[PDB]
From a paper:
The KD for the S52A interaction with the OM operator was 5 fold higher than the wild type, confirming the importance of this hydrogen bond interaction in stabilising the DNA-protein complex. Comparing ΔGs for S52A and WT, we obtain ΔΔG of 4.0 kJ mol−1, comparable with that for the Y37F mutant (3.1 kJ mol−1), and indeed in the crystal structure of the protein-DNA complex, both of these residues form a hydrogen bond to the phosphodiester backbone of the DNA. Five of the monomers in the asymmetric unit are observed to be in loop conformation I but the sixth more closely resembles that of conformation II, which is almost identical to that in the DNA-protein complex with the 19OM operator site. Both of the R46A crystal structures and the S52A crystal structure have adopted loop conformation III, despite the varying buffer conditions and crystallographic interactions in those three structures. The SO4 based interaction observed in the high-resolution wild type structure is also observed in the Y37A, S52A and monoclinic R46A structures. Both the monoclinic R46A and S52A structures show almost identical crystal contacts to those of the triclinic wild type protein, even though the space group and unit cell are different.
The most widespread of these mechanisms employs a “controller” (C) protein encoded by a gene downstream of its own promoter, and usually co-transcribed with the endonuclease (R) gene as a single transcriptional unit. The C-protein binds at various sites within the C/R promoter to regulate transcription of its own gene and the associated endonuclease gene. Unusually, in the RM system Esp1396I, the C-protein also represses the MTase (M) gene by binding to the promoter at the transcriptional start site, denoted OM where the C/R genes and the M gene are transcribed convergently from different promoters. Flexibility in this loop is very important for DNA sequence recognition, as it has been observed in the nucleoprotein structures to adopt different conformations depending on which operator site the protein is bound to.
Author numbering:
A (entry chain A), B (entry chain A): 3 to 79
Write the structure that this text describes.
């Protein structure tokens, strides 16, 4: 769906804005690299806990993440 | 965490605002009643797909859900 695609999109966008590789985000989020690579392809099975760990490893607040997600939904869906 | 607690909080708040029982939301979200009851206690393992199904079964847009979540984080965390 559009929402699944844009959750993965926003995670990859912030990660690249911070200059982080998938390996850097894996180490910082406590989730292994094939998990990060999988979630960025398809967020269907990403859990709210894993998403909190990723926001922490990105050093982005939950509020900012969700605001960037709402902007992408409003401007593109 | 605060975020896990407020995801469950916002789901239960909207469900009660719509006058729905847990059984009504289960039927409408395609998720069984013990899953709904579990997520409202602790959203740790709720997935983004299950959360999209719940927003659909609540007939709430993703944008509104996330806006209510940001308000609860900003005003209470």
């Amino acid at each position: 769906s559009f929402l699944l695609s844009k959750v993965s999109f926003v995670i990859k966008k912030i990660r690249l804005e911070k200059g982080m590789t998938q390996e850097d985000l894996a180490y910082k989020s406590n989730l292994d690299r094939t998990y990060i690579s999988g979630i960025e392809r398809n967020s269907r099975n990403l859990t709210i806990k894993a998403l909190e760990l990723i926001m922490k490893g990105l050093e982005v607040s939950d509020v900012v993440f969700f605001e960037m997600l709402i902007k992408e939904i409003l401007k593109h869906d």
